[PDB]
Amino acid sequence: TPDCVTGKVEYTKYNDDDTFTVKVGDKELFTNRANLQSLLLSAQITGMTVTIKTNACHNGGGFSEVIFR
Amino acid sequence: TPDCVTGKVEYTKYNDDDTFTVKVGDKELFTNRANLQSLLLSAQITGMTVTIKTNACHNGGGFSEVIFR
Amino acid sequence: TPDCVTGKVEYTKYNDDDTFTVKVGDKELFTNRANLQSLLLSAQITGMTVTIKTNACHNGGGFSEVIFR
Amino acid sequence: TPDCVTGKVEYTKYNDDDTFTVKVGDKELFTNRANLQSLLLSAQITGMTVTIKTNACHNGGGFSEVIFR
Amino acid sequence: TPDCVTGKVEYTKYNDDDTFTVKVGDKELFTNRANLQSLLLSAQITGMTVTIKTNACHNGGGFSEVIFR
Numbered sequence: 562t563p564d565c566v567t568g569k570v571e572y573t574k575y576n577d578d579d580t581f582t583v584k585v586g587d588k589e590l591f592t593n594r595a596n597l598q599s600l601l602l603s604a605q606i607t608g609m610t611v612t613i614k615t616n617a618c619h620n621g622g623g624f625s626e627v628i629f630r
Numbered sequence: 631t632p633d634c635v636t637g638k639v640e641y642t643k644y645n646d647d648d649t650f651t652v653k654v655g656d657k658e659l660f661t662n663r664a665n666l667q668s669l670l671l672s673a674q675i676t677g678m679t680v681t682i683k684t685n686a687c688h689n690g691g692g693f694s695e696v697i698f699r
Numbered sequence: 700t701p702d703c704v705t706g707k708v709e710y711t712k713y714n715d716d717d718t719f720t721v722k723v724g725d726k727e728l729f730t731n732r733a734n735l736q737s738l739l740l741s742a743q744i745t746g747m748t749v750t751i752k753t754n755a756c757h758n759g760g761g762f763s764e765v766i767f768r
Numbered sequence: 769t770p771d772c773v774t775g776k777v778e779y780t781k782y783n784d785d786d787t788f789t790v791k792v793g794d795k796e797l798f799t800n801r802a803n804l805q806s807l808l809l810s811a812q813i814t815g816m817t818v819t820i821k822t823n824a825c826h827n828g829g830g831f832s833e834v835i836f837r
Numbered sequence: 838t839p840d841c842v843t844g845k846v847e848y849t850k851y852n853d854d855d856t857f858t859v860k861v862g863d864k865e866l867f868t869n870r871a872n873l874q875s876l877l878l879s880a881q882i883t884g885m886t887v888t889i890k891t892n893a894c895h896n897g898g899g900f901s902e903v904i905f906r
């Protein structure tokens with residue numbers, strides 16, 4: 562799956578349908594994988610660089626793949 | 631959904647019916663989403679600014695949407 | 700529900716029936732709410748003041764309500 | 769249940785059958801309680817003293833009771 | 838089960854099929870055990886040494902056993 566954005570997590574958002582949004586770089590993206598919610602908030606709190614990989618690389622696009630560095 | 635309050639979490643409370651209350655700004659609000667309990671206590675501990683979005687923007691009102699910054 | 704004890708958590712204990720005991724002030728109290736285990740150990744680690752509310756305010760009494768400050 | 773060992777946790781191990789081993793003092797002990805995995809790793813990271821109570825107080829013995837201080 | 842690699846976690850990756858990859862030493866390995874995701878990210882954040890044990894000790898090999906030190 563191609564790299565879409567790499568950077569520090571700017572903010573996260575819990576959504577009404579239980580999906581989770583993250584803003585990294587210039588994109589707001591969401592995931593429906595519940596296991597990623599605490600992992601991404603941890604990455605946000607500790608200032609980790611993340612790379613999100615998705616073919617839906619546009620604002621509001623979905624993803625499931627993330628690299629934590 | 632409109633912004634209701636933005637600020638640091640002043641306290642949280644676990645309730646007898648397993649919902650979770652947070653006090654942000656001048657409002658006490660609750661959520662029935664279990665996944666948000668550890669996320670909100672983490673935001674409280676680390677001093678994150680949160681924005682809660684809800685149409686029930688009054689003391690005792692419910693919410694599911696939260697932005698963590 | 701009335702306030703029973705307020706203070707820093709002295710110790711916590713996982714029990715054989717999967718309930719969780721906490722010692723705050725002069726009371727040892729337990730809860731059967733699984734969601735509260737990680738929250739209470741976080742409060743213990745970070746030195747938060749907690750208030751436990753319960754009508755069974757005696758050693759070995761049960762509770763479900765907790766305020767984290 | 770009697771005290772078996774007290775001390776800082778030296779290491780933990782996730783096992784192939786999803787049980788979790790801890791080494792405290794001179795004993796390696798395991799638990800089948802999933803809820804204890806994150807609690808014990810937190811105790812390890814923060815240097816907490818733990819007391820494990822079990823009647824199977826020997827290397828490879830099972831436990832469910834733990835006091836976190 | 839034999840030791841395969843020991844070292845600090847270089848990066849972790851959440852995968853599209855909900856497995857989790859870790860790079861330790863010269864190997865990229867994955868696990869299908871959901872409970873290990875938060876444990877491994879905690880080990881990564883805090884700089885813990887981990888040892889992964891697996892008979893599939895090659896890039897892309899699976900594991901379930903991990904020692905955290």
Ligand SMILES: OC[C@H]1O[C@H](O[C@@H]2[C@H](O)[C@@H](O)[C@H](O[C@H]3[C@H](O)[C@@H](O)[C@H](O)O[C@@H]3CO)O[C@@H]2CO)[C@H](O)[C@@H](O)[C@H]1O
Binds near residue numbers: 615
């Ligand atoms: O978390 C939501 C969702 O994330 C992942 O899917 C993403 C989009 O939601 C999904 O529409 C997108 O599908 C692609 C196909 O991968 C591609 O082969 C096809 O040509 O175009 C569609 C539309 O762009 O894929 C992205 C991730 O690449 C995840 O796969 C999915 O299960 C779900 O978790």
Ligand SMILES: OC[C@H]1O[C@H](O[C@@H]2[C@H](O)[C@@H](O)[C@H](O[C@H]3[C@H](O)[C@@H](O)[C@H](O)O[C@@H]3CO)O[C@@H]2CO)[C@H](O)[C@@H](O)[C@H]1O
Binds near residue numbers: 631663684685686694
């Ligand atoms: O966590 C509890 C609850 O939070 C969210 O719902 C909130 C209130 O509980 C709910 O009564 C409120 O209803 C709104 C309608 O959505 C809106 O269309 C109408 O105009 O006004 C009523 C009353 O304010 O909605 C808020 C959220 O804005 C969440 O949606 C719900 O599922 C549940 O989690």
Ligand SMILES: OC[C@H]1O[C@H](O[C@@H]2[C@H](O)[C@@H](O)[C@H](O[C@H]3[C@H](O)[C@@H](O)[C@H](O)O[C@@H]3CO)O[C@@H]2CO)[C@H](O)[C@@H](O)[C@H]1O
Binds near residue numbers: 729732752
């Ligand atoms: O986690 C265990 C338990 O905690 C909460 O209940 C507590 C006691 O376990 C319960 O026996 C006690 O019951 C009270 C009633 O609240 C009171 O109205 C009646 O007059 O006397 C009885 C006996 O003391 O209540 C406390 C909490 O105040 C929690 O409510 C319960 O669901 C369970 O989680």
Ligand SMILES: OC[C@H]1O[C@H](O[C@@H]2[C@H](O)[C@@H](O)[C@H](O[C@H]3[C@H](O)[C@@H](O)[C@H](O)O[C@@H]3CO)O[C@@H]2CO)[C@H](O)[C@@H](O)[C@H]1O
Binds near residue numbers: 822
């Ligand atoms: O996590 C595994 C297991 O831990 C607890 O049980 C422990 C041993 O696994 C179990 O074999 C042992 O049994 C005791 C009897 O309870 C006792 O009555 C008899 O005298 O001796 C045997 C052998 O030592 O008990 C220990 C705990 O003391 C936990 O109870 C069990 O449910 C399970 O979680």
Ligand SMILES: OC[C@H]1O[C@H](O[C@@H]2[C@H](O)[C@@H](O)[C@H](O[C@H]3[C@H](O)[C@@H](O)[C@H](O)O[C@@H]3CO)O[C@@H]2CO)[C@H](O)[C@@H](O)[C@H]1O
Binds near residue numbers: 838868870894901
């Ligand atoms: O998380 C994925 C997976 O990890 C563990 O299995 C690993 C490989 O996925 C599995 O193919 C491998 O099988 C071994 C046999 O157990 C062994 O008897 C034989 O000699 O070699 C094969 C191939 O290496 O085992 C490793 C772990 O050593 C875990 O056991 C499995 O349930 C699953 O979680």
Ligand SMILES: OC[C@H]1O[C@H](O[C@@H]2[C@H](O)[C@@H](O)[C@H](O)O[C@@H]2CO)[C@H](O)[C@@H](O)[C@H]1O
Binds near residue numbers: 787796798828829
């Ligand atoms: O305590 C060390 C070992 O724990 C686990 O095995 C225990 C127990 O020791 C053993 O006798 C029993 O057959 O299985 C238990 C787990 O269900 C691990 O599986 C071992 O690798 C040791 O770490």
